[PDB]
Ligand binder design. Sequence first.
Ligand SMILES: CN1C(=N)N[C@](C)(c2cc(-c3cccc(C#N)c3)cs2)CC1=O
Length: 390
Amino acid sequence: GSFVEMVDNLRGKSGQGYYVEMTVGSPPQTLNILVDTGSSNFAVGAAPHPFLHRYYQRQLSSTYRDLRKGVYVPYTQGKWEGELGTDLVSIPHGPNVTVRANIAAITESDKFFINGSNWEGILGLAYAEIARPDDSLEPFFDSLVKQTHVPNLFSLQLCGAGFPLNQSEVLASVGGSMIIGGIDHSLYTGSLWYTPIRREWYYEVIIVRVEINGQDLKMDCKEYNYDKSIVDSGTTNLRLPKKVFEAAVKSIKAASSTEKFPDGFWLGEQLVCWQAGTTPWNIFPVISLYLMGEVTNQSFRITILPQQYLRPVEDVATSQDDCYKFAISQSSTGTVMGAVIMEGFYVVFDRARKRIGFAVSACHVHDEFRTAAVEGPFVTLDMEDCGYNI
Ligand SMILES: CN1C(=N)N[C@](C)(c2cc(-c3cccc(C#N)c3)cs2)CC1=O
């Protein structure tokens, strides 16, 4: 590991997201910021809110600059309104540099901030194409690279605990690492395998084959990327296009048929519990996603375990049972490789070489019989045909 100052700088969990500490303004105002590769705006709470115990106070920053422009950002569920401006920003447990970046000061919001959560803003790490209001608002990472000598690359190791973390524990626990400008070898084992970034807007990739316990889902590969497939640290679940989700659930149900689970479980609505320590990991299948490789007609696969797709949750009766929710769900906006996938791997967002690397995470949860994996290469033809076009 060559980046000790940044190792273990994240906190959180898949259900609440993972955040890094940042400072904004002069003198510096400390805030916890959600690390989100699924968006491109740096936005922070800038007004009192019931679920925030601190926020950005522009009037107390001598380096604050008003851009005199508002921004409205609506999401599937939730939305916020803010005022655009710039200020000096730093990451305490990050590169030792300070940069002037755009900041959306959130003044009004609805179902955005989460009661119980510990973050006060979001750091959109994706590209300008999807920034709001438009691509003219330079994203934080672009500013960082343009203003310093930090290499145009970052890597993320999200660490699921494998069990529930209570309010106090989740605040004291190490949730992972965000290495800005490099790759830390202590965070993974084995080799890194890279897939191309198809287009620079979201971190879009192309899935070319899917297997459930080695059995080919056997769908037209275009279905797996309809209408796109992205890597998003800001999404909890592994989300799959409707048809792919239906086929995957049918296969996962068949593989785990020795035990029957209620429809509510497969819908990700209700939890299932087992006596402490007896979770039947072995009856659930591993899931492999094959991704386009960097060499023509070559692909590689990343394999996750149920320890990744069954999200630990505290039981309603806070019993001693080990409980989980099914963390694979349907999407009408393409495949989303969320925390479920990311917790199994160290993921390298190599913007400089327009590629995303995957390696088995040194902190992935597993058992004595199976482990997550990243393996290759495999001969795969016409992978370009797997990509979707409107
Ligand atoms: C999916 N996705 C995204 N990646 N980023 C956006 C900005 C947002 C993510 C969150 C959010 C909140 C809490 C936990 C997690 C988690 N985990 C993500 C709130 S807005 C919009 C969106 O819909």
